[PDB]
Amino acid sequence: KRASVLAIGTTNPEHFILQEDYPDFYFRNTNSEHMTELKEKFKRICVKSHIRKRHFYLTEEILKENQGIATYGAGSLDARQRILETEVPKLGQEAALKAIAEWGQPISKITHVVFATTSGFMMPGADYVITRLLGLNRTVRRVMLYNQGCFAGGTALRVAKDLAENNEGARVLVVCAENTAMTFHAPNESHLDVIVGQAMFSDGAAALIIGACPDVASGERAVFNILSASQTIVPGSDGAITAHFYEMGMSYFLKEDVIPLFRDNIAAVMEEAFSPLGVSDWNSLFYSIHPGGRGIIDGVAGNLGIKDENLVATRHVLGEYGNMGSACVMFILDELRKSSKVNGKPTTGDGKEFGCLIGLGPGLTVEAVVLQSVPIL
Amino acid sequence: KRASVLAIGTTNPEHFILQEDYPDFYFRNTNSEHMTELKEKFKRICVKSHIRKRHFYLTEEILKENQGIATYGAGSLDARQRILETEVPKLGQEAALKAIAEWGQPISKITHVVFATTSGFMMPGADYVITRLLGLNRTVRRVMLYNQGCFAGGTALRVAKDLAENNEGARVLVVCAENTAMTFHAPNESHLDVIVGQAMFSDGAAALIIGACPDVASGERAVFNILSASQTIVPGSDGAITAHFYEMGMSYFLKEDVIPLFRDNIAAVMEEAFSPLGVSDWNSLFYSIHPGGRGIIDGVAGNLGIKDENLVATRHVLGEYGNMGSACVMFILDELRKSSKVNGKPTTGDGKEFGCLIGLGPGLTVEAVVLQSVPIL
């Protein structure tokens, strides 16, 4: 009678770049090699990032064919959309097929779709495209979530939750996907917000299948259960994150006190979701914190007092992929369940009963989804 | 147990223009009086449109600064967004306050918000802004439906339906709002899809309160009961409507066979929806069809054999407000119940029991929402 995660799939584009070689690549293919001062500010953040590699659609050749994207301030939304209109629902398809395989059921049994992305937008949306790409039924009930940032991962789950629970027999396909072709910019002295993003942002795609009352006889296997899903605006945070969709693509602004505002308010958000269960100790849980850089983790960590033991899964994704936007949190969920089977843990939650999903985005906004593990045999 | 409409509220900008005087206004304030031949076609279209007046935020002086918006092809997305980022949620606020006045409950009772808009987008979205303007709780669960076109009105009804029915005591605030500053273009000889759109689009905004199990003792009153809600892709209609968000704004393209596709495929949707109610006679129902111009309405009615008696509310909205996009279907619902009280009809559905809200848009896509009337006292 409660919603459950029945399958999980992930994927990234084949092309990847090592962080050790990114500063040279980023300044060479923007003809900004002469900005010696910025090359140092950027390099220091790369070292502090503790990110090893990132996947990208954008290659050295594709940027040569799109100088508008390679020039800061220049109009390029025309060229950016030509790429995103196709590659985003396509990368999603790759992920959906992996999760539909584990599910091991007929395509016709899918009745809903929830697509979440900030990378590109048009009409019809990616939710129509992937419906035709996967060959789903023409009567699937779709819900498109455009431009909700990095918390959209928690949003998608909250929407799918009420869908599966209010429609008997319902099976929901959820897809998160991103592509740095939307937010890529060349270095600029006045707008140093870019510097932080270009040493962080990557792309990827995750896919989930939600459904109530798992049919064990049919071959369905629950992975996580969803007990609750809340959303909260953070007090005194107006303006901390703002992103505009201009002719130059997405132009974003970061205030110097994003982490302190999240840090000094996360305690209250946890207290609300977990009192119905009588939980107080924050180390009795498994976590899937949105990897919004080391600061956000190492800072949400200290406040709640989370030991390094429980941040292994979240820090692992950050290191091997970077910030993939809304797909980061589903990536970390797949990380746990799989790591748990290898290490012989009693449950899919690293041997723990309850866990939490933390998504962070503009507002400030915080999405909190309470999860429950299942036994491993 | 079953979601119900509890209140309705609408509004428009004060500034309006008569269809009588729009062709002069259009070719004058875009510096295009030298296109005399093109002006006559427009004139003809404006006369066959059955639209009497439309309300716009865009006045003659506002176009006078942002000449980019008044010049076809020119990059003007920035200027459009500076307008839409503020004016759209401000227009929604004015509508919501009317619905809460009728609802007659404390603002602390609202638990969810659903906003749908194609006109403009940023981060955080217009769901955050309307949450601050109305002074709602920081812990409200909100959904942002961007760029779902003219069927978004029915989608907003379907999401809110599953939220209110899956959450005890939950009360959902629906808001739809559109602004022509996104779709405004100067006349061009080549792109004749633009010319037909300028005689159609308007500004407006509507609001509803959705909740399951009305509390009579708390002063709540029902208006319509939501029995079901569906979505469907039309077979073999790929590319019938496409819209791109380029640097010039929302560039849309309409192929020549849009009406014949909706016309011949709508019957299957109605049969699937009303079959479990034992209904087949389409004139025994009240309607709220999306007025995408005369063409759509006449084509849909001609197939199902709907008489002019049951299309008065639809045409009245198109005649007095023009095509406002996603808000049209909400306007018609309000005219239905308001007209019903004045004429002495026994129900909010023109005396009838069951009715249907039809949302049409790109895909092609068809949103059907079976509705039930309540007794008038």
Author numbering:
A (entry chain A), B (entry chain B): 18 to 394
Q: What did the paper state?
A:
In contrast to BIS, benzophenone synthase (BPS) generates the core chemical scaffolds of xanthones, guttiferones and sampsoniones that are prominently found in the closely related Hypericaceae and Clusiaceae families. For comparative purposes, we obtained a synthetic gene derived from the gene sequence of H. androsaemum BPS (HaBPS). Similar to previous reports, HaBPS produced 2,4,6-trihydroxybenzophenone (phlorobenzophenone) when incubated with benzoyl-CoA. Additionally, unlike MdBIS1 and MdBIS3, 4-hydroxycoumarin was not detected when HaBPS was incubated with salicoyl-CoA as a starter substrate. The crystallographic models of HaBPS and MdBIS3 contained 772 out of 790 residues and 757 out of 776 residues, respectively. A significant change in the HaBPS cavity arises from the small-to-large replacement of Leu263 in MdCHS2 with Met267 in HaBPS. Similarly, the side chain of Met267 of HaBPS replaces Leu263 of CHS and blocks access to the coumaroyl-binding area of the CHS cavity. Similarly, the side chains of Thr135 and Glu195 and the main-chain atoms of Gly166, Gly342 and Ser343 line the sides of this novel pocket in HaBPS. Mutagenesis of Thr135 in HaBPS to Leu resulted in a reduction in chain-elongation steps from three to two and a shift in the terminal cyclization mechanism from Claisen to lactonization. Presumably, a similar water-mediated hydrogen bond stabilizes Tyr269 of HaBPS; however, the lower resolution of the diffraction data for the HaBPS crystals prevented the analysis of waters. However, higher resolution structures of BPS are needed for comparisons of subtle changes in backbone, side chain and ordered waters between BPS and BIS.
Type III PKS catalysis involves the loading of a CoA-tethered substrate onto an active-site cysteine followed by chain elongation via iterative decarboxylative Claisen condensations of malonyl-CoA. Linear poly­ketide intermediates undergo a terminal intramolecular cyclization reaction to produce the final cyclic polyketide product. The five-layered αβαβα topology of secondary-structural elements of each monomer is consistent with the ‘thiolase fold’ originally observed in thiolase and present in all known structures of type III PKSs.
